[PDB]
Design a protein around this ligand. Structure first.
Ligand SMILES: Nc1ncnc2c1ncn2[C@@H]1O[C@H](COP(=O)(O)OP(=O)(O)NP(=O)(O)O)[C@@H](O)[C@H]1O
Ligand SMILES: Nc1ncnc2c1ncn2[C@@H]1O[C@H](COP(=O)(O)OP(=O)(O)O)[C@@H](O)[C@H]1O
Ligand SMILES: [Mg+2]
Ligand SMILES: [Mg+2]
Ligand SMILES: [Mg+2]
Lengths: 139, 7, 372, 747
């Protein structure tokens, strides 16, 4: 990473600093990594965070300099399509079924996140064009 | 029998 | 399914039947007759020899022979006629289909067992057979595992002590007195009264007199004093021609020779002393249990009063402090058959039979090692 | 391996036979499992067993226990427990068998609309119900003229009667009708009175096998019914263990004794008579035997036993009771006599119309006849008692056969029977803290029925393997014939018992010794209990059962002296008593041999027929509606052979899938390279990649056959793939939404 990249990332980081001490919480680290173009799993985020306990995850604060090695470690289409084709072969996906699996399997997300990402992508039948939805969410 | 008694 | 035949050859009566029925369905004398007079009428269907009840019916014209004398089979061709008559005529059963169980007195020659087995396998083709000791079967019949069996048929008398199912073979006593030689004694004393019974048919008449009118005195001397001094004891019997004959002290005096064999001129002691001398050969821990069971068997023990005479003089010989008990069921004439009928129907016994496989392999010699 | 983190296993527990646990750290080969419970546990893994793995939840609750991929005791108990408690379904297939759980509650499912809904439907089509067995038997009978049986097994109170009742209600409704079902239901009070007894575990245990034949005409209209009976427990009439009763009728009769009609019988209270007295327990809690008498007589009336015959029956039973009081004084070791002017025998002779002097003579003497010559001879006090008790048993068994024939006169109909469907109510395998000649006979009958079952199921598997054209060799027969030959061959336990009855001075001490000599180390199924010389163990299909020798010789003896029968046949006081006998080797047969013969008649009746099996289980002792007790039920699933049936199916190919439904389920595993438009060849290609061993499955014509593990293994790899895809996608979605919120943070 060059100085400019580190500066842009730090500026973004400081925008996410809600206390003014130049730091974010551990629980925001994943959000910042995702905000910077990475797509780490929650497990990967916790690993680079050092698998923090609830208390430090909710109240311990880290500056950009401590976040940075973690960002580096995290940083270092056809599979994505087949992964979506799992839930298909007419190029659609039920909105109900995608909602159910994302809110009920794996590292479950909230219904509001799923509604937000799914807004405008399902048709009148309640079908999602997953190639278009995938390109959209990868953009 | 064969010696002593008659049968 | 298949049920063993059970046959007891005896002397006098053959008695035979099927295992697990309760009394023999063939009983008849083991007697063979041959006609001795010149036959006159042409075209009569006249026959070479008669067996069993035929020879009793015609006995006026026949010489009657017994093929068994003192439990030894003396004449083999007549014995085959008696078995042939038993299986085909009396039981109406083909012998190939049934195990056969055969009965014998102890201490008699081995050739007798070898021949009985060679005949049952080779001529009759009996699939399996066994030869059993007569006295042992009277315990099966009387529900005991212990006792000194006293057995007397026609021919041989024997004692066999048994204790919890072990025989004591050194203590077996055998005596040739019983049953036929009482009849040959009765024929001899009746001549003293002026009656003469010589022929083999007249011997069958004297056998019937003996079976009806003889009894054993409790005290032999008191009754000879009484019968010399009275008519009170005297009974009369009607011969087959309607003559009537009158019999006095002879009737108790005949079976007393069981207890005093010197009358006929034997050396040996009476049945009471061979019973006691048989218990004295057993080891002292068991004598108490033999005195408490004495089992009488066979027809010569049927005389009225023979139990009470036995108990009286064995109680004279025995030590004073013991129960002597004589067991004499009213059925005892059949006890050896009833005991063999029980034995042949046990399930444990189905491995005991000599099978024809073994006779073919080992020859008739096998009987000695496999049977008792 | 299969034991991964977040696996689930069943672990044994004292208070419910198994409990669930989640495997908190994955296992590697050794001695440890870290387990988590719905908390925290460590469990010793010990010789060897791993704890039974747990089925994936898609399989749990399905209508057929053989649809489960892991087949084992806790999975079966769990599927029955969820279907019963949560669904309130009470019927569940296991293979061919229908398992039926007593709800102790009324249910709507028996309505005639449902009767119609089941008619004409094959077993695949509909959820299991007793009508689905009745309907199968009915159409099998239509297809092929072969008669059909329905066989209902379980501990009494498991609802075997109600199952038969609804089974015949089905026939009455589908055929239409002739008022059989009412008469058959009206017969149950008398058959329960003469044939049932209290037992240590159970009131109203049934001690006989009852076979109802429903006969059909050429139209398959119901003609009428015929009733047979088998395996009656004769020995109970004269002997009971502690806390057992005689057959109910004796106590109903005794309690009635105050009534005007029964005054002439001179009945006493039930602990006066020797045959009722022994058990210790005259009164059942919560039954009024005096009231039950009324239902008995009422059912006699409805079936048309005249009140003349009813007083005849109660005369004969009071006869048996008074007979049991006759008491012999031994005047010698080998002779006995009845004390003069004996009141029990005086009343017995008055009741039965016989000369006192002839019964008093013939009870104490026995008669033997050579063809020319007859001897009367005495018998000991033991033989006199054994012969009196054999007379009481012979009267009772003939009275029972007579009441059954007078029921049959009411049930028969004159139309010639074209064919029949027959329903067999029979007791299941039995084990108590003490086991005795009764339990030995019951467990031997159950060994015979279980053989006939195993061999029918094996036949049906060979047919299904031809139908799918799979080689037969893969299925092996499991044969309990060695255990049958232990009991009934020559030199078997029953054979040596019948020998020791006639053997002189036979006894329970010497019989056991003959067993140990013959069997003890020659047969694997017979074992001697370590600490005792009076008992023996037989390894039955269900379990090892330990039998005490101490009763069997008294219970096994029957011998009835002809002279004692001929006294009773001579009676002219009343007409029933000579009628019972009207009818020689059979008088010599022991109880064990009469039982073995009645069982061969039963096996001939069933082998003629094509069976269908129902098993009834009783989920709790206290009759609480829809409660289930795992420790109660595991006993009855063991006794009904459901668990061995399942073990025998768990070897082999228990799980079967249509190619269509398999492909539908597992498209997710297939790569789009290898999806052909022929599904069957795709499946054959894919499964050989997913499962290494061709042995672990077979390709049938229309169905794939799996061994037990494999379908759950496929469910595991499916779920783990679908989990990985879900996580990967949802991390992408969350990443986009945080990137959008960063775009807001610039904006
Ligand atoms: N499927 C069922 N539906 C409703 N009630 C049932 C069912 N099965 C059993 N029961 C009840 O269980 C009780 C006894 O059933 P029943 O068939 O009469 O057994 P039983 O009288 O003990 N015959 P047995 O089992 O040989 O002793 C009664 O209260 C029935 O109503
Ligand atoms: N009632 C009887 N009283 C006395 N002697 C009898 C009686 N019946 C048969 N006998 C005699 O006993 C012998 C028959 O006894 P049995 O046991 O039949 O002989 P075996 O044992 O050889 O067959 C014959 O001598 C016969 O005379
Ligand atoms: Mg004799
Ligand atoms: Mg009931
Ligand atoms: Mg019942």
């Amino acid at each position: 990473f060059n100085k400019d990249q580190l500066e842009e990332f730090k500026e973004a980081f400081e925008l996410f600093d809600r206390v003014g001490d130049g730091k974010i919480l551990y629980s925001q680290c994943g959000d910042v990594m995702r905000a910077l173009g990475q797509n780490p799993t929650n497990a990967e985020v916790l690993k680079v965070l050092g698998n923090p306990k609830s208390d430090e995850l909710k109240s311990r604060r880290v500056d950009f300099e401590t976040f940075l090695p973690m960002l580096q470690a995290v940083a270092k289409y056809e599979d994505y399509l087949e992964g979506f084709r799992v839930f298909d072969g007419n190029g659609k996906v039920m909105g109900a079924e995608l909602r159910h699996v994302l809110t009920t399997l794996g590292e479950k997300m909230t219904e509001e996140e799923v509604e937000t990402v799914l807004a405008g992508h399902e048709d009148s039948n309640g079908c999602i064009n997953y190639e278009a939805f995938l390109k959209h969410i990868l953009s | 029998w064969x010696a002593x008694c008659p049968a | 399914e298949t049920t063993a035949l059970v046959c007891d050859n005896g002397s006098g009566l053959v008695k035979a039947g099927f295992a697990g029925d309760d009394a023999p369905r063939a009983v008849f004398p083991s007697i063979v007759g041959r006609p001795r007079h010149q036959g006159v009428m042409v075209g009569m269907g006249q026959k070479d020899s008669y067996v069993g009840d035929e020879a009793q019916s015609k006995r006026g014209i026949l010489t009657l022979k017994y093929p068994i004398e003192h439990g030894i089979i003396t004449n083999w061709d007549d014995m085959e006629k008696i078995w042939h008559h038993t299986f085909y005529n009396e039981l109406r059963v083909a012998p190939e289909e049934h195990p056969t169980l055969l009965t014998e007195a102890p201490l008699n020659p081995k050739a007798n067992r070898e021949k009985m087995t060679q005949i049952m396998f080779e001529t009759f083709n009996v699939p399996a057979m066994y030869v059993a000791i007569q006295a042992v079967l009277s315990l099966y019949a009387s529900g005991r595992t212990t006792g000194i069996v006293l057995d007397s048929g026609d021919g041989v008398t024997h004692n066999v002590p048994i204790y919890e199912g072990y025989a004591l073979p050194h203590a077996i006593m055998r005596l040739d007195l019983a049953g036929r030689d009482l009849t040959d004694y009765l024929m001899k004393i009746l001549t003293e009264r002026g009656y003469s019974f010589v022929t083999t048919a007249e011997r069958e008449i004297v056998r019937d007199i003996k079976e009806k009118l003889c009894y054993v005195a409790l005290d032999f001397e008191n009754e000879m004093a009484t019968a010399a001094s009275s008519s009170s004891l005297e009974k009369s019997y009607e011969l087959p021609d309607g003559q009537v004959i009158t019999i006095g002290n002879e009737r108790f005096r005949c079976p007393e020779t069981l207890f005093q064999p010197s009358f006929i001129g034997m050396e040996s002691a009476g049945i009471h002393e061979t019973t006691y001398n048989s218990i004295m050969k057993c080891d002292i821990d068991i004598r108490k249990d033999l005195y408490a069971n004495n089992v009488m068997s066979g027809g010569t023990t049927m005389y009225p009063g023979i139990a009470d005479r036995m108990q009286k003089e064995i109680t004279a010989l025995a030590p004073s402090t013991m129960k002597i008990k004589i067991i004499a069921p009213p059925e005892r004439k059949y006890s050896v058959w009833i005991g063999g009928s029980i034995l042949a129907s046990l399930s444990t016994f189905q491995q005991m039979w000599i099978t024809k496989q073994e006779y073919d392999e080992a020859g008739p010699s096998i009987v000695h090692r496999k049977c008792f | 391996e299969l034991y991964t983190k977040y696996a689930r296993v069943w672990i044994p527990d004292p208070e419910e036979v198994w409990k669930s646990a989640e495997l908190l750290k994955d296992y590697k080969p050794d001695k440890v499992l870290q387990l988590r419970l719905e908390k925290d546990l460590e469990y010793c893994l010990d010789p060897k067993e791993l704890p039974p793995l747990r089925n994936p939840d898609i399989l749990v609750g399905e209508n057929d226990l053989t649809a489960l991929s892991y087949l084992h005791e806790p999975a079966v108990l769990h599927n029955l427990k969820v279907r019963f408690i949560d669904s309130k379904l009470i019927y569940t297939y296991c293979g061919i068998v229908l398992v039926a759980i007593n709800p102790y509650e009324q249910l709507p499912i028996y309505g005639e609309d449902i009767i119609n809904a089941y008619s004409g439907q094959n077993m695949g089509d509909m959820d299991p119900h007793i009508f689905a067995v009745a309907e199968e038997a009915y159409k099998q009978m239509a297809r092929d003229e072969r008669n059909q049986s329905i066989i209902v097994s379980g501990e009494s109170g498991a609802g075997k009667t109600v199952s038969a009742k609804y089974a015949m209600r089905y026939f009455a409704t589908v055929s239409g009708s002739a008022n059989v079902e009412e008469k058959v239901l009206a017969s149950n009070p008398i058959m329960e009175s003469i044939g049932n007894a209290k037992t240590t575990r159970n009131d109203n245990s049934s001690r006989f096998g009852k076979y109802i034949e429903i006969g059909f005409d050429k139209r398959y209209r119901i003609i009428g019914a015929n009733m047979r009976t088998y395996l009656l427990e004769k020995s109970r009439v004269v002997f009971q263990a502690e806390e057992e009763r005689n057959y109910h009728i004796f106590y109903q009769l005794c309690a009635s004794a105050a009534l005007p009609e029964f005054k002439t019988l001179r009945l006493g209270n039930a602990n006066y008579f020797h045959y009722t007295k022994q058990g210790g327990s005259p009164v059942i809690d919560g039954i009024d035997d005096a009231k039950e008498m009324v239902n008995t007589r009422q059912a006699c009336t409805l079936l048309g036993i005249s009140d003349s015959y009813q007083m005849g029956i109660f005369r004969i039973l009071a006869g048996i009771l008074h007979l049991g009081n006759v008491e012999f004084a031994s005047r010698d070791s080998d002779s006995c006599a009845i004390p003069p002017k004996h009141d029990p025998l005086t009343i017995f002779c008055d009741l039965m119309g016989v000369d006192y002097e002839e019964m008093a003579h013939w009870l104490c003497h026995r008669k033997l006849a050579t063809a020319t010559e007859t001897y009367i001879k005495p018998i000991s006090k033991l033989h006199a008692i054994n012969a009196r008790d054999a007379l009481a048993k012979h009267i009772y068994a003939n009275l029972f056969n007579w009441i059954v024939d007078h029921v049959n006169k009411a049930l028969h109909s004159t139309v010639k029977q074209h064919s029949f469907i027959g329903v067999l109510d029979i007791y299941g395998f039995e084990t108590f803290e003490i086991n005795s000649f009764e339990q030995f006979c019951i467990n031997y009958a159950n060994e015979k029925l279980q053989q006939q079952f195993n061999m029918h199921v094996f036949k049906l598997e060979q047919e299904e393997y031809m139908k799918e054209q799979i080689p037969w060799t893969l299925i092996d027969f499991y044969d309990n014939q060695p255990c049958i030959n232990l009991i009934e061959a020559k030199m078997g336990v029953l054979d040596l018992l019948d020998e020791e009855c006639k053997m002189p001075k036979g006894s329970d001490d010497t019989w056991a010794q003959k067993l140990y000599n013959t069997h003890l180390n020659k047969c694997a199924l017979f074992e001697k209990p370590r600490l005792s010389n009076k008992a023996f163990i037989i390894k039955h299909f269900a379990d090892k059962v330990e039998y005490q020798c101490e009763g069997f010789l008294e219970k096994n003896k029957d011998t009835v002296y002809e002279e004692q029968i001929k006294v009773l046949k001579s009676s002219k006081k009343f007409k029933l008593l000579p009628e019972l006998f009207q009818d020689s080797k059979e008088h010599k047969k022991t109880v064990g041999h009469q039982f073995r013969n009645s069982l061969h008649l039963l096996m001939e009746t069933l082998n003629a027929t094509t069976p269908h099996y129902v098993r009834c289980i009783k989920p709790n002792d206290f009759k609480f509606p829809f409660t289930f007790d795992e420790k109660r039920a595991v006993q009855q699933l063991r006794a009904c052979g459901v668990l061995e049936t399942i073990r025998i199916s768990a070897a082999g190919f228990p799980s079967r899938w249509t190619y269509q439904e398999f492909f539908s389920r597992y498209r997710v595993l297939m790569k789009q390279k290898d999806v052909l438009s022929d599904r069957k060849q795709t499946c054959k290609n894919v499964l050989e990649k997913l499962i290494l061993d061709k042995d672990k499955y077979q390709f049938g014509k229309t169905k794939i056959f799996f061994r037990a593990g494999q379908v759950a293994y496929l469910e595991k790899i499916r779920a783990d793939k679908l989990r990985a895809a879900c996580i990967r996608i949802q991390k992408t979605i969350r990443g986009w939404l945080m990137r959008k919120k960063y775009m807001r943070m610039r904006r």
